[PDB]
C-alpha cells in the first residue's frame, strides 16, 4: 500500500521551508502536510514534499507523541543545525 520517502529541504532566505503543517498529539489528528507552497524549497528539491504527506520522522526523531507546537519547534531548530538541512521521513499513500 503506502511507502516511505526521505525528503531533505534546506530553508530559503526567510528561514522558511515552504509547507504548512496540521496535526499533533494535542490535536486529535496525525501530523500531515496541508499545503505545499509552489516554487519553495519543499516544492523544488528531489524528491519533493507533497500535500497530504504524513510526517513520520523529523531528523530521525520519532514525533508520534509530540504536540503541534513541539513539532513546529523541532522543524524550526533544524535550520540553525549541523548541516542547516531538514530531513523528513514521510508516509505517502
Amino acid at each position: 500500500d503506502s511507502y516511505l520517502v526521505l525528503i531533505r529541504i534546506t530553508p530559503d532566505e526567510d528561514g522558511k521551508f515552504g509547507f504548512n503543517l496540521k496535526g499533533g498529539v494535542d490535536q486529535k489528528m496525525p501530523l500531515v502536510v496541508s499545503r505545499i507552497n509552489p516554487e519553495s524549497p519543499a516544492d523544488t528539491c528531489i524528491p519533493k514534499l507533497n500535500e497530504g504527506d504524513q510526517i513520520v520522522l523529523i531528523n530521525g526523531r520519532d514525533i508520534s507523541e509530540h504536540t503541534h507546537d513541539q513539532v513546529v519547534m523541532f522543524i524550526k531548530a533544524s535550520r540553525e543545525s549541523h548541516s542547516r538541512e531538514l530531513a523528513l521521513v514521510i508516509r505517502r499513500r
Partner: peptide, 7 residues
C-alpha cells in the same frame, strides 16, 4: 480552533 502552521 484547529491548528495550521506555516513554516
Amino acid at each position: 480552533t484547529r491548528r495550521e502552521t506555516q513554516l
